[PDB]
Design a protein around this ligand. Structure first.
Ligand SMILES: CC(=O)N[C@H]1[C@H]([C@H](O)[C@H](O)COC(C)=O)O[C@@](O[C@H](CO)[C@@H](O)[C@@H]2O[C@@](O)(C(=O)O)C[C@H](O)[C@H]2NC(C)=O)(C(=O)O)C[C@@H]1O
Ligand SMILES: *[C@@H]1O[C@H](CO)[C@@H](O[C@@H]2O[C@H](CO)[C@@H](O)[C@H](O)[C@H]2NC(C)=O)[C@H](O)[C@H]1NC(C)=O
Ligand SMILES: *[C@@H]1O[C@H](CO)[C@@H](O[C@@H]2O[C@H](CO)[C@@H](O)[C@H](O)[C@H]2NC(C)=O)[C@H](O)[C@H]1NC(C)=O
Ligand SMILES: *[C@@H]1O[C@H](CO)[C@@H](O[C@@H]2O[C@H](CO)[C@@H](O)[C@H](O)[C@H]2NC(C)=O)[C@H](O)[C@H]1NC(C)=O
Ligand SMILES: *[C@@H]1O[C@H](CO)[C@@H](O)[C@H](O)[C@H]1NC(C)=O
Ligand SMILES: *[C@@H]1O[C@H](CO)[C@@H](O)[C@H](O)[C@H]1NC(C)=O
Ligand SMILES: *[C@@H]1O[C@H](CO)[C@@H](O)[C@H](O)[C@H]1NC(C)=O
Ligand SMILES: *[C@@H]1O[C@H](CO)[C@@H](O)[C@H](O)[C@H]1NC(C)=O
Ligand SMILES: *[C@@H]1O[C@H](CO)[C@@H](O)[C@H](O)[C@H]1NC(C)=O
Ligand SMILES: *[C@@H]1O[C@H](CO)[C@@H](O)[C@H](O)[C@H]1NC(C)=O
Ligand SMILES: *[C@@H]1O[C@H](CO)[C@@H](O)[C@H](O)[C@H]1NC(C)=O
Lengths: 87, 55, 55, 387
């Protein structure tokens, strides 16, 4: 459903094999994980605030492991792996 | 394509690298290739949009 | 609250919203703030949404 | 911050110059380049354009950059103009005229020159073609180019090869999906068995060009030569011994010649600047004024690097501990205090220059004024205000 053109029409099924695996490791920004360096600004020996975009801690990672072995199903598209990329 | 998929460089692949219909060269806003240290163990990404500007 | 070393390397970061501890930590721009009472201005109340006023 | 360049100068100054039959194709997309530095670095001689001018390049941006590169023969220089009906424009390369393009004439030294000769055809190379055994610095150029169909093999059946006692035509077995010849006997008592085939004695001058398997095909834009003319009777397995496939010798092909570029110990290489997408695109020249000059101290030189505008005195301070991507450094509040150049790997500390006031005491019974510059030295005032 993601594409808008037809390329292949063989070895296509609708078997339920999707697994929404949820990770058991929460976001830990205490060691710099998730923090991104500023595009051009650089600070030296400074502890300044930054109203940027960082991942919220206490939220477990949502794993998206998708592969294919000579067959593919249309079920992985849309729900539940494809989510609405809001911001 | 309606059913996209990518191939590997190790051993073989189930299908071929054909998930679109790019028979010519399209127009891109950022097209280049960068090499990273493959010997590492982790890799972190970040993609956020602000005022219609990608990052 | 990003902390930079002498070489500009990030080591510790404060969430500012994980709990009240992060708010007190980043309120005074220090990983170990001084003692005293801290009135957390901006406490989460989790209200409801109100729309479509009727005459 | 700057963007990576297209490295056009590194490609135009390549020591591996190609032959006119196989011009190198290079497309540059999403990059930048400088026309002034490119023209200054290359040993250009002339610059011409079709339906365009070099003065309009500044300001307008193109979608992509398409370039051509091939050697220029010494005896084939006067026929390089547009619209000329020479041998080069008829069977080697076609120059587009309905689109905007520019012609660049630059020269390269005779030393460190390596030629590369290879025919860009399928049937020409597949039907017994070895390497181009030519001399050094030999610029090969074709004269007549012929094309064949995808179901024609330059050979015939072995049944008719043994039917001619004298001047028999050679034949072999071509792969599937191909058609044989149409040889027939025309004995008029001149010899023992006089038999002839189609396209005789040569494909260029044939009595019946309609029945010929190969015809003269004109060269087009973005398309190399279709192959040299080859005679069907001059190639093939003799007597139909059925040893190999329908393979023909290299000497059977005709319609090409070679020349040289030795002229004042230098060789000329043509360059076609094919540009598309007028005043719209991503990759184009950026020869405008940028704040990249010889910076120096002792005066608050205006700085406009990394999208930050300010006024301050530069100071040379060694700073090697910066990261591979780090270019500046900020203070506690968040203002610029310095930067680091990306072309000379030099670091500078920005110091605000003098913008203060001056105190002047005046008395009602006096005439002059007692000027007093607070927190300043007499040498600085004398060297920065007046004598
Ligand atoms: C997320 C998930 O559950 N992944 C499965 C994966 C998919 O179910 C399947 O490959 C996609 O194809 C469909 C839609 O059926 O299947 C794995 O097991 C295969 C089950 O078919 C396994 O038997 C593989 O089968 C092959 O026949 C093949 O190429 O399909 C041979 C292959 O060696 C074999 N793979 C092995 C042994 O690793 C899978 O592909 O691994 C199991 C995943 O967890
Ligand atoms: C496809 O299979 C998955 C795996 O069992 C199903 O997901 C389960 O759905 C039930 C019903 O809500 C839950 O109680 C389970 O916890 C789910 N398991 C997992 C691993 O997520 C899914 O419902 C199936 N889809 C269809 C259409 O049958
Ligand atoms: C980085 O910042 C810290 C925080 O101010 C500096 O530590 C101070 O250093 C001065 C001079 O050595 C002392 O008088 C202060 O007492 C220190 N503060 C604390 C809280 O210990 C540190 O010197 C700075 N480092 C660099 C290289 O500038
Ligand atoms: C690429 O990554 C590898 C692994 O992340 C780096 O190799 C490490 O180098 C350090 C430096 O002495 C050693 O202590 C580690 O034991 C090495 N690990 C491994 C797995 O070899 C390597 O240095 C990196 N290269 C670059 C250019 O960054
Ligand atoms: C592919 O899509 C096009 C356009 O929707 C349609 O004309 C064509 O018939 C389709 N072909 C197949 C095999 O589905
Ligand atoms: C990819 O295409 C080539 C050329 O048609 C073919 O030889 C090859 O087998 C294909 N590979 C797969 C995995 O289909
Ligand atoms: C990377 O891009 C350059 C373009 O200049 C190209 O020449 C090169 O082949 C590319 N390499 C890979 C591995 O894609
Ligand atoms: C052209 O040269 C100037 C001089 O420093 C430079 O600032 C500019 O980035 C260059 N433009 C390119 C390479 O496109
Ligand atoms: C170019 O020629 C000069 C003089 O013959 C020689 O010193 C130099 O090494 C050559 N460079 C290359 C890349 O061949
Ligand atoms: C400047 O520093 C970088 C970072 O290591 C290095 O790669 C580069 O060679 C240096 N010199 C120049 C001229 O960029
Ligand atoms: C200024 O000069 C006049 C001239 O007579 C004198 O009367 C007056 O006292 C003077 N005032 C001062 C402040 O010197």
């Amino acid at each position: 459903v993601i594409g808008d053109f037809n390329c292949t029409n063989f070895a296509i099924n609708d078997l339920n094999t999707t697994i929404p695996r949820i990770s058991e490791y929460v976001v830990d920004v205490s060691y710099g994980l998730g923090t991104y360096y500023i595009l051009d600004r650089v600070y030296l020996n400074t502890t300044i605030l930054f109203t940027g975009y960082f991942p919220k801690s206490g939220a477990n990672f949502r794993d998206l492991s998708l592969k294919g072995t000579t067959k593919l199903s249309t079920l992985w598209y849309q729900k539940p792996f494809l989510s609405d990329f809001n911001n | 394509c309606e059913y996209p998929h990518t191939i590997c460089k190790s051993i073989g692949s189930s299908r071929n690298e054909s998930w679109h219909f790019d028979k010519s060269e399209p127009l891109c806003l950022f097209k280049k290739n960068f090499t990273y240290n493959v010997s590492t163990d982790w890799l972190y990404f970040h993609f956020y949009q602000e005022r219609g500007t990608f990052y | 609250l990003l902390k930079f070393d002498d070489r500009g390397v990030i080591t510790n970061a404060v969430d500012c919203s994980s709990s009240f501890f992060s708010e007190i930590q980043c309120k005074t721009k220090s990983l170990l703030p001084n003692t005293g009472v801290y009135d957390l201005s901006g406490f989460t109340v989790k209200p409801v949404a109100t729309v479509h006023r009727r005459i | 911050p700057d963007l990576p360049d297209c490295d056009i100068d590194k490609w135009l100054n390549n020591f591996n110059v190609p032959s006119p039959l196989n011009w190198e194709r290079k497309i540059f997309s999403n990059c930048n380049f400088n026309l002034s530095t490119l023209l200054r670095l290359v040993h250009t001689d002339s610059f011409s354009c079709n339906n365009f001018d070099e003065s309009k390049i500044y300001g307008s941006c193109f979608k992509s950059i398409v370039l051509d590169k091939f050697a220029i023969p010494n005896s084939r220089r006067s026929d390089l103009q547009l619209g000329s009906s020479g041998f080069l424009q008829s069977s080697n390369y076609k120059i587009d005229t309905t689109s905007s393009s520019c012609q660049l004439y630059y020269s390269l030294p005779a030393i460190n020159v390596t030629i590369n000769n290879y025919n860009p055809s399928s049937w020409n190379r597949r039907y017994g073609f070895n390497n181009f055994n030519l001399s050094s610095h030999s610029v090969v150029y074709s004269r007549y180019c012929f094309s064949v169909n995808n179901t024609f093999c330059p050979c015939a059946k072995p049944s008719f090869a043994s039917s001619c006692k004298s001047h028999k035509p050679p034949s072999a077995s071509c792969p599937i999906g191909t058609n044989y010849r149409s040889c027939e006997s025309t004995t008029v008592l001149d010899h023992t068995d006089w038999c002839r085939c189609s396209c005789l004695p040569d494909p260029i001058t044939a009595y019946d060009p309609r029945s010929c398997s190969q015809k003269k095909s004109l060269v087009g834009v973005g398309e190399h030569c279709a192959g040299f003319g080859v005679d069907e009777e001059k190639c093939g397995v003799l007597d139909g011994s059925y040893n190999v496939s329908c393979l023909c010798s290299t000497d059977a092909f005709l319609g090409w010649s070679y020349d040289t570029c030795v002229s004042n110990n230098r060789c000329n290489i043509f360059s076609n600047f094919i540009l598309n997408g007028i005043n719209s695109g991503t990759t184009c020249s950026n020869d405008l004024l940028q704040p990249n000059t010889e910076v120096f101290t002792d005066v608050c030189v205006d700085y406009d690097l990394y999208g930050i505008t300010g006024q301050g005195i530069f100071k040379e301070v060694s700073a090697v501990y910066y990261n591979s991507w780090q270019n500046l450094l900020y203070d506690f509040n968040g203002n610029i205090i310095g930067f680091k150049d990306f072309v000379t790997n030099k670091t500078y500390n920005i110091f605000p220059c003098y913008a203060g006031r001056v105190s002047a005491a005046f008395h009602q019974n006096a005439s002059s004024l007692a000027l007093l510059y607070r927190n300043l030295k007499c040498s600085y005032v004398l060297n920065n205000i007046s004598l």
